[PDB]
Amino acid sequence: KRRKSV
Amino acid sequence: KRRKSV
Amino acid sequence: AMGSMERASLIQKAKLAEQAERYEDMAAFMKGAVEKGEELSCEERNLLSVAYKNVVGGQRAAWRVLSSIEQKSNKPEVREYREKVETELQGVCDTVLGLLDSHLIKEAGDAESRVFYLKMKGDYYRYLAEVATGDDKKRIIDSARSAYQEAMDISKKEMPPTNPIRLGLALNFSVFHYEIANSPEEAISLAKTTFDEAMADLHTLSEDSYKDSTLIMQLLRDNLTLWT
Amino acid sequence: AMGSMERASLIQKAKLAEQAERYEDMAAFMKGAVEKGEELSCEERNLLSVAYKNVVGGQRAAWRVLSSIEQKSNKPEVREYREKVETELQGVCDTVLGLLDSHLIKEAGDAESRVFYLKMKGDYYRYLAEVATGDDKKRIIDSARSAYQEAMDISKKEMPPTNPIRLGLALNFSVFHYEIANSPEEAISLAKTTFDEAMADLHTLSEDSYKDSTLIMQLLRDNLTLWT
Ligand SMILES: COC[C@H]1CC[C@@H]2/C1=C\[C@@]1(C)CCC(C(C)C)=C1[C@@H](O[C@H]1O[C@H](CO)[C@@H](O)[C@H](O)[C@H]1O)[C@H](O)[C@@H]2C
Ligand SMILES: COC[C@H]1CC[C@@H]2/C1=C\[C@@]1(C)CCC(C(C)C)=C1[C@@H](O[C@H]1O[C@H](CO)[C@@H](O)[C@H](O)[C@H]1O)[C@H](O)[C@@H]2C
Ligand SMILES: [Mg+2]
Ligand SMILES: [Mg+2]
Ligand SMILES: [Mg+2]
Ligand SMILES: [Mg+2]
């Protein structure tokens, strides 16, 4: 998937 | 649901 | 502000904006293509209609959320903000209606182009009618009815009952009857008759055409299920 | 153009725009609230950050689609349109960075406000670095690093290891290491250490606080799984 950021 | 339009 | 770009570049940029889900850009590229003054092809009319349907679809969804919040509220902020969104949606419908009347419809001689544009004219007055309260709610409603009626008269004369534009036209005109004109019986009869006349014509279709007709037939069926 | 509206009305309109998923409006309402010159509360900083994160999130998603199309292409249209979207994303990051530097950061004396704004400063330079190719790609990268580093130094001194802003900061700084600075080992070590130090502090939390810390802990875990 796409890596997470917040 | 919501009625359909197109 | 698209007057200096080539027509073909505007169309290609509209396709790029669609892939990128940038629908306001897509609509502005298509407005600029229409303003080049040449008639649109089938594929280009589809692009124009998808761009504005998505833009106004977002404004209408937001207007319903704010209208709903506002109803519960009966300070000035929700009413003022619903008004701002309402003005912006009105300006989009006016822009589309101006394109159709200057001069897409006047130049549209084939059934598939003329019915397509007349359906859009009916749709964009219908969006105006969704928000209208004034001295002119009734005239806006009747402008929608008259555009859809002219489109229906042409489609029944010139297009097969399975033609996707004829099907979509009837689907939306039936929604107009149901929730704008408060004529649920007419909405139901139109959607049933359309569905039934298309079923009896499916046999004439290739596998490709059969798939695009049956898709909008299913939305006719969805509304009949919801309404009956 | 929000100078004539009351600060409280702008905030209330930002909340309405959020419910309506009108994030450009939400960001413009929040810009106007910041420009009133008063410090933001916790809830107002959250609104500001959600509005711009959503706006730039849309521009970055579109820029990636166009960049990808363009790469495959190696006429001028995709490059020109990717450039247009790129300029617009750059102007949004410049707007956010200008708000932070005039004068959110200078006035932010509490750890939770100062670290929050420094994280945003690191994020918006990181978005600029995602698209940068010039003489100043390196200075943009180092501006992101320096903002995130200052935020990390304050958070480790002033906030518990489970604090959601400290957690989110580390999550993004680790993404910066991995895909902007080409330091995957540093990205992994930062995400592992952050995760582990937060696990050991969960016991101190109420059920409410435990739920907000564990949510961002899971994104730390997601990236560690993806990268190892
Ligand atoms: C003015 O009212 C235009 C609508 C009347 C019915 C319907 C209308 C609009 C759109 C363009 C959007 C939804 C669909 C399909 C998916 C239902 C179509 C189109 O569909 C055409 O175009 C879209 C390309 O975007 C494709 O997904 C289809 O494969 C293609 O056949 C279909 O042939 C007719 C033109
Ligand atoms: C500058 O970097 C701001 C981010 C650093 C971590 C994270 C950041 C941003 C946001 C506002 C958006 C996503 C979340 C949660 C859902 C992860 C939050 C926030 O979450 C707060 O706000 C949102 C209200 O919108 C709620 O859903 C949560 O219930 C609330 O605790 C959380 O406390 C911290 C402030
Ligand atoms: Mg030319
Ligand atoms: Mg003609
Ligand atoms: Mg005041
Ligand atoms: Mg202060």
Q: Is the dihedral of CA D131, D135, D138, D144 positive or negative?
A: negative
Nearest CA to ligand 2 atom 25: D46
Q: Which of C158, C162, C85, C154 is nearest to C122 (CA)?
A: C154
Given a contact cutoff of 8 angstroms between Cβ atoms, the answer to whether C119 and C151 are in contact is: yes
Partner-chain contact D65 C20, CB within 8 Å: yes
C149 is written with which tokens? 């009626």
Q: Distance (Å, rounded) from C-alpha D128 to C-alpha D96?
A: 11
Q: Which of C80, C81, C85, C88 to mutate to test binding with chain D, by most D CBs within 10 Å of its CB? A: C81
Partner-chain contact C78 D16, CB within 8 Å: yes
Partner-chain contact C81 D17, CB within 8 Å: yes
| Strand ranges inside C59-216, DSSP E | none
In chain B, the residue whose alpha carbon lies closest to the alpha carbon of C167 is B6
Collapsed DSSP state (helix, strand, coil) of residue C177: helix
D158 is written with which tokens? 């002033």
Given a contact cutoff of 8 angstroms between Cβ atoms, the answer to whether C152 and C169 are in contact is: yes
- Inter-chain contacts counted by CB atoms under 8 A, chains C and D: 52
Cα C108 to ligand 4 centroid, rounded to whole Å:
5
DSSP C1-65: --TTS-HHHHHHHHHHHHHTT-HHHHHHHHHHHHTT-SPPPHHHHHHHHHHHHHHHHHHHHHHHH
Query: What secondary structure letter does DSSP report for D101?
Result: I
Q: Which of D13, D140, D29 is nearest to C78 (CA)?
A: D13
Mention every residue, 6+ apart, whose C-beta is less than 8 A from residue C41: none
Neighbours of ion ligand 6 (CB under 5 A): D 107, 109
**Rg of chain A taking only CA atoms, in angstroms:** 5
Given C16, C65, C77, which is nearest D19 (Cβ)?
Answer: C65
* Tokens 């042409």, residue located: C154
User: In the PDB record, what is the listed experimental method?
Assistant: X-ray
C138 is written with which tokens? 């009734």
Q: Distance (Å, rounded) from C-alpha D29 to C-alpha D35?
A: 10
User: What's this structure's resolution in Å?
Assistant: 1.9
Q: Is the dihedral of CA C78, C82, C85, C91 positive or negative?
A: negative
* Probe target for ligand 2 pocket from D11, D30, D45, D46, with the most ligand atoms within 8 Å of CB: D46
* Tokens 């009351």, residue located: D6
Q: Which amino acid would we find at residue C150?
A: E
Burial class (CB in 10 A: 0-12, 13-18, 19+), C111: middle
Domain range D1-228, CATH architecture: Up-down Bundle (1.20)
Q: Distance (Å, rounded) from C-alpha D26 to C-alpha D18?
A: 6
Q: Which atom of ligand 1 is nearest to the CA of C117?
A: 1
Which residues in chain C are closer than 8 Å to B6, comparing Cβ atoms? 168, 171-172, 216, 219
